[PDB]
Each structure stands twice: as structure tokens, then as C-alpha cells.
Amino acid sequence: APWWKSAVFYQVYPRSFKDTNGDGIGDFKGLTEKLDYLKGLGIDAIWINPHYASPNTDNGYDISDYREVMKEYGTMEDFDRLMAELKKRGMRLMVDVVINHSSDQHEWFKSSRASKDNPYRDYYFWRDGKDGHEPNNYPSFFGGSAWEKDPVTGQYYLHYFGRQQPDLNWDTPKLREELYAMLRFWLDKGVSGMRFATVATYSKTPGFPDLTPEQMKNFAEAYTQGPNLHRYLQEMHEKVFDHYDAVTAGEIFGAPLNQVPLFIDSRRKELDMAFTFDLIRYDRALDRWHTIPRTLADFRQTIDKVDAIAGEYGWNTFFLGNHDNPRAVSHFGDDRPQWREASAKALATVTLTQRGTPFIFQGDELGMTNYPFKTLQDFDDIEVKGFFQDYVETGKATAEELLTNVALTSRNNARTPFQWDDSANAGFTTGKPWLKVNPNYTEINAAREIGDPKSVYSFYRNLISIRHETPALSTGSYRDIDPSNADVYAYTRSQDGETYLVVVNFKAEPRSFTLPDGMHIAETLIESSSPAAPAAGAASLELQPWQSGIYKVK
Ligand SMILES: OC[C@H]1O[C@@](CO)(O[C@H]2O[C@H](CO)[C@@H](O)[C@H](O)[C@H]2O)[C@@H](O)[C@@H]1O
Ligand SMILES: [Ca+2]
């Protein structure tokens, strides 16, 4: 059982964590200042979003030099000190690895775009248009065609994401060797983990035939069907990860769940663990902007399908939130002032008793909410400007339809500054924050949470302890008591003849729970929103609105 199977991770979007120089952008110094806070919470390891030199058309996901640090975050010396200060606390760092595409300002692309005979030409994908139009019908995730004509050579380069994010050509051995050398540069600095963004799209289909209309309906899935993908990931492991001790994590965006085992089965020598989208997008329409009503029954059944593809040799991450999705309490909980803390704790109990390695998103430990967008600029983000181009400019929807829906699903919901206290701009910055702070910072902030044994924060800290001390709760098997139940989420975790029972009321009303025939409460480890723990030997539970609990059973 490697260290990573029982670790609890915390994801820090540095741009919005803590500013230390007034420019309104979070930075490395600000993260280094808060390690004590993170340690005190119980956090073993941090995954930071892209921290490399970038023009920031996509807040670090368009990388212009893989070997320099983002100017906004600090210098290489600031990154080294972060590493050092993490190590002092026996903490580990996972970095984000963005090698499906680079920025169009990367030196490689500047060279590549110069002529068709340039030595870098095949570091990207260049093709002639067909029939006066693009080379084929590929759509981009961030608006319009995935192909962009370059007047310099008259050909089109491929970009699955933004126009300023040209896809890297993995079919070219020289480029793969460069990528590997780049990974060693960071690994040699002692980085403990790497998360590969959109790891499933690295392999492109030879010939670039047009997508079928079915394929066009789910293009994301088509872009994960490159015929050399597993070949390339296995090569990366042989030449890189085999020689180091880091954990690898794949963001498997767009792939069908049944293919996930190919990425994570320890025996195949590709990656260690999976970030999947089935759960967190379980109520998102195919357009990635509308929502579809779902029940708890939908929620638990997805989790069960997801757990099942881990098998014996695979391993999952678990998360309810990240920098690409709405806030966990607003999305899966109830964010109204009277149910917010109660449901946030109930979500905490879920997160920390899932099988897999949990990732907690910055701010969820405080019960941070979605942002109340009013304006146009509140929504500012390459992906929504993409939705405008594809849905508004084309007359498929009105701006106000877009914004009503995007208010609920926008990435910007997760990127509002972390709420440290009740000072100006919640103590995030002394300047003017890059995105506005949520007004509810006056009720929802770290300083107020940490001082209160009854807070969301304190509930998270207690859960993390209980998990750290209970093997079954990280590496134990998982079993859903009743997948068709849409009121109360019940499951067991077991290891080595010990069994724990997690019960979570998802209704804002009293509910009852009857334990499995022959099973009885032995001890109560923790509850939220309960006025009294069950009696030793209880065969059922009386549950308050939003109540959660962990029990040892016999
Ligand atoms: O937000 C659109 C879509 O992008 C994904 C692809 O994995 O997210 C990763 O890659 C993007 C493009 O570089 C980034 O904008 C994003 O921040 C990054 O995590 C999906 O998760 C997401 O649905
Ligand atoms: Ca700053």
C-alpha cells in the first residue's frame, strides 16, 4: 500500500490562494506563508495548478517555458523555498503537467510556425485546409474550429483548447524526448507527484478524418481514442517514472469509464491514479454548460461504477470540487445560510470516507459557496467566451440564457479568492483582487472557522484525523448498502475484519435508517448535526436534516 493510497491531498490554485505583494494575484510566498495552516488542518500533500511561465490566456494552462516559474507567482528561488518549507513539515508537492498543448508563445511554436521546413515544424500539427475550409470538422473546447490558419505558411495548426494553446505532436520522437527531459528537470528538484492535465488526448488519429455526426455529438470522447495513447504513456513511464519515486495522476477527460483501467492498472506501468469526470459532471449536459436534474440515486450509482473500475490493481482519486467546477456545497449541498454548514459537513463526511485518495479543493474546508455573478465581466474566462462564440453569436441561445446557466456551472465559482478573515478583501490581498471576493466572506473565513470547535473547518480537521487513524477508511473495500435509495446515502468500508458504516442524510428533513439485517452499531466515531449518538447495539438510526456520521459496526 503506497503512501499515496492513504494520503489526503489539498489542491491550491495559487492564483487565488494568497497574494503577498498587492498585485491582486496569489503567489508562491503567499502559499509558503500558509503551510502551517495547511499542516494544522492535517494535509499530507498539496497539488498546485500550473506554476510555469505563461501568458495566462488560460491561467497557466498555456505554458510558454516549462522550465521557468510563472512571473506572477515569483522566481525559481521562491519555488525552491516552497519545496524546502514543505519538506520541513514532512509535506509533499504534486505539480500539474500540461503537455497536451503549450502556449503559442513557446519558443518551439515560434520556430515551428516560421516555415514548413523548420526543424520544429513537427512539434505541432500542421495541415492544408480541405475545400476552402479547415482540414476537417474538429471542434475546439474553447470555441469554433480546432484548426487555426497561419498566414505565415497558409496551413492550419491544431488546438483542442484555446487558439493560443497549439497541441503538441506526440507522434514525433524528438518532441517526446524533450517532454521527458522536462519532466526529469522537475522530478530532480524532488517533486513528489505529477498530475497530467487531459492525459487522454495526447494521441491524435492519423489522417485526421472528419468526425461522424454521432462522434460530433460527443467530440470529447472521440479525442481520447488516439491509437498510440497507451503506447505513449507506457513509454513515458519507462523513460521517466520508473527511475523516480513520484506518484502519477491522470486527468482522464472525456474517456469512457470502461477505459480507465488502461491508465491506472499498476501492472500496465502507465499511471498511479485516476481523476475522472463521471461524478463531478454527473448532472452536466453534453454542452458542459447546462445542468440536468439528478437525484442521490444517480450520485451514488456513479460512485459505485467508478469504484468498480479500480479493480484490484487500479486506484482512484476522489473529489467533489476543483478549479474547473462550481463549489461543492453549492453543487452537491445546500448553500442557503440555514443549511450551508450542515450540508458542507455532510459533504466533508462523504469526501473523507470514500475509497480512493481524496482531494480537498481550497476553501471547501470553510464551506465557501458559488459566487453571485451580476455582470458580464464577473464571468470572464476563456471557456465562457468560447460558449459565447458557439452558442450566443450563432443564435442558439441568448446571452441571458447563457449567463443564468453559467452562474451555476462557471469555473469562476471556484476561483474567487480564498477567504482568510474579515479584513479588506477577506485578507487575500492588500490590493485589488484579480477576481472579486465573495461578499459572504464576512460570515465565511479561516480566522472565524479555526477559532470555533463547531465550524466546518473543525469538522474537516477531525475527519482527517479519524481517517488517518483508521485503515479501512482509506484502503478498505467499499459497498453501497442501497444504490436505489435517494434520501440517505449509506455505505460500509472494511479492512482486515473491521467494518465502518457511513450514513449521510441528503434531505433537509428528518429521515430514518435501518441497518443491514444482522449488523449493529458498536461505537460512534463522529457525527454532524446530531443531537445524540446512537446507543451501543442500535439496529437503526433516527436522522436529523443533513445529518452525517461514521460508525464502527459489529
Ligand atoms: O474547462 C474545459 C475543460 O478543460 C479540461 C480538460 O481536461 O481542464 C483542463 O484543461 C483545460 C485546458 O488546458 C484548462 O482550462 C483546465 O483548467 C484544466 O484543468 C476539463 O477538465 C474541462 O471540462
Ligand atoms: Ca502577488
Best probe residue, ligand 1, of 253, 278, 290, 359 (max atoms within 8 Å of C-beta): 253
Residue nearest to atom 11 of ligand 1 (CA): 61
- Exposure string over 316-332, b if 16+ CB within 10 A, otherwise e: bbbbbbbbbbbbbbbbb
- 324 C-beta closer than 6 A to ligand 1: yes
Q: What is the dihedral of CA 306, 342, 490, 286, to 10 degrees?
A: -30
Q: Which three cell numbers, joined as nine digits, stand for 273?
A: 491514479
Residues with CB under 5 A from ligand 2 (ion): 19, 21, 23, 25, 27
The dihedral region occupied by 208, where left means phi > 0, alpha psi between -120 and 50, and beta the remainder, is left
Q: How far apart are CA 64 and CA 84, in angstroms?
A: 26
539 close to 503: Cβ distance less than 8 angstroms: no
Where is 472: in which H helix or E strand? helix 472-475
Q: Which three cell numbers, joined as nine digits, stand for 77?
A: 528561488
- 253 C-beta closer than 6 A to ligand 1: yes
350: three-class secondary structure by DSSP: helix
Q: How far is CA 549 from CA 364, 493, 527, in A?
A: 19, 13, 4
Residue 531: how many CB atoms within 10 A of its CB?
8
Where is 358: in which H helix or E strand? strand 357-361
**The ligand 1 atom nearest the CA atom of 322:** 19
Q: Which three cell numbers, joined as nine digits, stand for 489?
A: 446515502
Determination technique used: X-ray
Domains contained in the chain, CATH given: 1-102+173-476 (3.20.20.80), 103-172 (3.90.400.10), 477-554 (2.60.40.1180)
229 close to 200: Cβ distance less than 8 angstroms: yes
> Which residue reads 523548420 in cell numbers?
118
Q: By 3-state DSSP, what share of the chain in percent is helix, strand and coil, each rounded to 5?
A: 35, 20, 50
> Ligand 2 center to residue 29 CA distance, Å?
8
499: three-class secondary structure by DSSP: strand
> Which residue reads 479500480 in cell numbers?
310
> Ligand 1 center to residue 117 CA distance, Å?
32
> Ligand 2 center to residue 8 CA distance, Å?
27
Q: Which three cell numbers, joined as nine digits, stand for 3?
A: 503512501
End-to-end, the C-alpha distance of the chain in Å comes to 26
Q: How far apart are CA 266 and CA 277, in angstroms?
A: 21
H, E, C per residue of 263-323: HHCHHHCCCCEEECCCCCCCCECCCCCCECCCCHHHHHHHHHHHHHCCCCCCCEEECCCCC
Q: How far apart are CA 458 and CA 452, in angstroms?
A: 7
Q: How far apart are CA 280 and CA 258, in angstroms?
A: 17
309 close to 260: Cβ distance less than 8 angstroms: yes
Q: Which three cell numbers, joined as nine digits, stand for 475?
A: 484502503
| Residue 450, phi then psi, degrees to nearest 5 | -65, -25
User: Could you tell me which of 377, 404, 389 has the C-alpha nearest to residue 142?
Assistant: 389
170 close to 196: Cβ distance less than 8 angstroms: no
**The ligand 1 atom nearest the CA atom of 288:** 23
175 close to 169: Cβ distance less than 8 angstroms: yes
370 close to 335: Cβ distance less than 8 angstroms: yes
163 close to 148: Cβ distance less than 8 angstroms: yes
Where is 36: in which H helix or E strand? helix 35-41
Q: How far apart are CA 229 and CA 252, in angstroms?
A: 12
Ligand nearest to the CA of 27: 2
**DSSP state letters, 178-202:** HHHHHHHHHHTTT--EEEETTGGGS
Residue nearest to atom 18 of ligand 1 (CA): 197
Q: How far is CA 450 from CA 438, 444, 454, in A?
A: 19, 11, 9
Q: How far apart are CA 392 and CA 198, in angstroms?
A: 27
Q: Which three cell numbers, joined as nine digits, stand for 445?
A: 473565513
Q: How far apart are CA 382 and CA 182, in angstroms?
A: 27
The amino acid sitting at 435 is L
Q: How far apart are CA 105 and CA 148, in angstroms?
A: 15
- 58 C-beta closer than 6 A to ligand 1: yes
- Dmax (CA) for the chain in angstroms is 78
492: three-class secondary structure by DSSP: strand
19 is in an annotated binding site: yes
Q: How far is CA 139 from CA 35, 142, 215, 222, 405, in A?
A: 42, 9, 11, 11, 22
- Exposure string over 12-31, b if 16+ CB within 10 A, otherwise e: bbbbbbbbbeeebbbbbbbb
> Ligand 1 center to residue 105 CA distance, Å?
19
**DSSP state letters, 187-248:** HTTT--EEEETTGGGSSPPTT-PPPPHHHHHTHHHHTT--TTHHHHHHHHHHHTGGGS--EE
> Ligand 1 center to residue 31 CA distance, Å?
23
Q: How far apart are CA 69 and CA 85, in angstroms?
A: 17
